[PDB]
């Protein structure tokens, strides 16, 4: 009951779109659990998605709306990262300390640390954020953080 009644219907809507695409009888593959929550505006780590019923592969389990609502409620209260955290993290790899980093060192951190992402995924965020290199192979990472945080209708 912390979840308002219209927030409940915002969930009913997202659930139905995915229910439609799962080759439908009004149910949702437990594997797409992370994606559904991402469309409601939260940014959970894979680990948290697993701690609530998500699966590693498709066709292993289904979820009726009644089992979905309490999993969502559980993920709302997990930790979410700030701008100040993200900059402390990157200064860690700044040799001169002038706010630059090579695209090289950039790719490397995104694909070898934390929860590694795919080269195709790294390719697509760099495409979408329109991030750009300078003559000596460098990039300023503060600009990158901000564009990611602003989201895809980075608008204004």
């Amino acid at each position: 009951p912390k979840l308002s009644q219209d927030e409940i219907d915002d969930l009913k809507d997202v659930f139905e779109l995915f229910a439609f695409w799962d080759g439908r009888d009004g149910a949702v593959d437990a594997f797409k659990l992370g994606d559904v929550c991402r469309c409601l505006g939260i940014n959970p780590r894979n680990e948290d998605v697993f701690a609530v019923g998500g699966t590693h592969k498709m066709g292993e389990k289904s979820l009726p709306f009644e089992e979905f609502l309490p999993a969502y409620e559980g993920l709302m209260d997990c930790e979410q990262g700030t701008f100040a955290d993200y900059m402390e993290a990157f200064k860690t790899f700044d040799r001169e300390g002038q706010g630059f980093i090579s695209g090289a060192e950039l790719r490397h951190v995104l694909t070898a640390l934390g929860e590694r992402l795919s080269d195709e995924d790294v390719d697509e965020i760099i495409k979408l954020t329109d991030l750009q290199e300078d003559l000596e192979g460098n990039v300023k990472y503060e600009d990158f953080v901000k564009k990611v945080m602003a989201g895809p209708y980075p608008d204004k």
């Binding site: 439609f20 695409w21 799962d22 080759g23 439908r24």
Partner: protein, 156 residues
């Protein structure tokens, strides 16, 4: 114009209805303004395969009252209730042709119809692809749309 309980606004065209009266009068073999059980028998027996279980009684059942040109027009219209145009259908398909090739891979369109949405069963799938234009492993949705829409290029 009238009710057989479905149609709200029959705006199906004038050439389209002029044809039908030429058809109706050829079917009304006894010349009296009504299609009888015996009119159908005669005419259909002539053109070849001719239904005679009393599905002939079933055919006349479909109309709530005596069968004049006006009841005729009415029952056909109920059948065309719920149908979109060629432009609407062709752009629906195009929503899946990202490279604007004006075609779709056959493996892709088959997966879309059978495992997603209000998915097809095996008998629907079989009757849909028996007739379909395919070459080089490429489904031609433009040609398929004009076909099911009855476009008169050549069906002479």
């Amino acid at each position: 114009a009238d009710k057989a309980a479905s149609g709200v606004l029959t705006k199906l065209p004038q050439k389209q209805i002029q044809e039908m009266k030429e058809a109706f009068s050829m079917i009304d073999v006894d010349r009296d303004g009504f299609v009888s059980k015996e009119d159908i028998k005669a005419i259909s027996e002539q053109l070849g395969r001719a239904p005679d279980d009393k599905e002939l009684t079933a055919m006349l059942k479909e109309a709530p009252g005596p069968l004049n040109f006006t009841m005729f027009l009415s029952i056909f219209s109920d059948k065309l209730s719920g149908t979109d145009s060629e432009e609407t259908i062709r752009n629906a398909f195009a929503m899946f042709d990202e490279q604007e090739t004006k075609k779709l891979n056959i493996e892709y369109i088959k997966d879309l119809l059978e495992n997603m949405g209000d998915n097809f069963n095996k008998d629907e799938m079989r009757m849909t692809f028996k007739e379909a234009p395919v070459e080089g492993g490429k489904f031609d949705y433009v040609k398929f749309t004009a076909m099911i829409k009855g476009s008169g290029e050549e069906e002479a």
